[model samples]
Target: KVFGRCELAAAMKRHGLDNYRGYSLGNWVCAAKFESNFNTQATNRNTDGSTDYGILQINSRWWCNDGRTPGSRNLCNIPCSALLSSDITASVNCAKKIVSDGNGMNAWVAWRNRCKGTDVQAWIRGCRL
Candidate 1:
């Protein structure tokens, strides 16, 4: 599903992303905007046989098992396909696991490259979710 920016904020805020792992809501929303454009079905296969899935784009190499990444650890202990579901609860859960594992929001390339240290509030401006 494609989400409007504020819609994604409400969904994420309801799931506790406002300050999860010390990252603010805008931090997450900014990453989602650039990472998947809020598309739940987004997927990107890496050259190393790992694949990224969902709005958060958690990778299969360690976070999930796609049954294709040869050395997947399944740290999220979920099928990569689960991230593609429109519910987004699974995606949010997996992301929690990702940051809890000490990776923090840096797990997302877009977060590191764009969202980090920026005034991400612009991504959530006027959206009082």
Candidate 2:
């Protein structure tokens, strides 16, 4: 129920999937749902001021400094908006690469196979990608 080229592209880029190279958008989206229930603006009160943002739940504040501009902590640089631009697709592709990298959705899938039908906290810990 969530496969639109335009929307998926935007969503993928937003979540950092422009050059993912992983399983597929399908696997990527499912991993995101597994991560934060698909909440784009997903934020958790982290003491590190690193509240992960967007669908991929990237820790913008903490990780954005790697290559992006310093002020990317703002949503404007969060990558979610990138989907709207023609520069790339949604973060799905990016997530796919993550999955292929042996840590993204693949990790979640393995966790699910092992921890299905478990407690929420346990699931979180087990599936924390």
Candidate 3:
């Protein structure tokens, strides 16, 4: 409950992410929902032996591991294992920064539909839930 509420609130503060997500939470969960069902504890296999990892469900090979040079870690501070650390608030927050200019949340294509100028709560009640 703490994790969910913290993550929710973090999203809220960062992207104005609120209860419904359209006007606020920026609906990053929409993308996260698509990616990992908001599991905050998801893992999956890639075609190669390596795994796609993390809460935002990052592909360690693609984003973290492969990018790690032989002698040192990549410029990114969040390690691949750390990415899977179940801190949904942190993971989602990082994802928000990675995908947005830090100005927004990554809702994938939700913005196209929701940004069309409807009241967020009503939109959620009618279409986005």
lDDT of 3 at 10: 54
Model 3 C-alpha lDDT per residue in residues 8-101, reported as the tens digit of each score: 4454445433533333543443445445555655767665544555545665543455443343333345666666655554565455445554
TM-score of decoy 2: 0.40
Model 3, position 44, has a per-residue lDDT of 77
Q: Which stretches of candidate 2 lie over 4 Å from their true place?
A: 1-19, 65-129
lDDT of 1 at 91: 90
All models, RMSD in angstroms: 0.9, 9.7, 6.7
Tell me the tens digit of each residue's lDDT in model 2 across 66-91. 23334544423334343223333344
**Residue lDDT tens for model 1, 1-129:** 999999999999998888998888999899999999999999999999899999999999998888998967898889999999988899998899887877688878899999899999999999969
Candidate with top lDDT is 1
Q: Residue 28 in model 2: shift from native, Å?
A: 0.7
List TM-scores for all candidates, in order: 0.96, 0.40, 0.50
TM-score of 3: 0.50
Q: Look at candidate 3 and tell me the lDDT of residue 74.
A: 32
Candidate 3 regions with alpha-carbon error over 4 angstroms: 1-26, 48-50, 66-75, 101-129
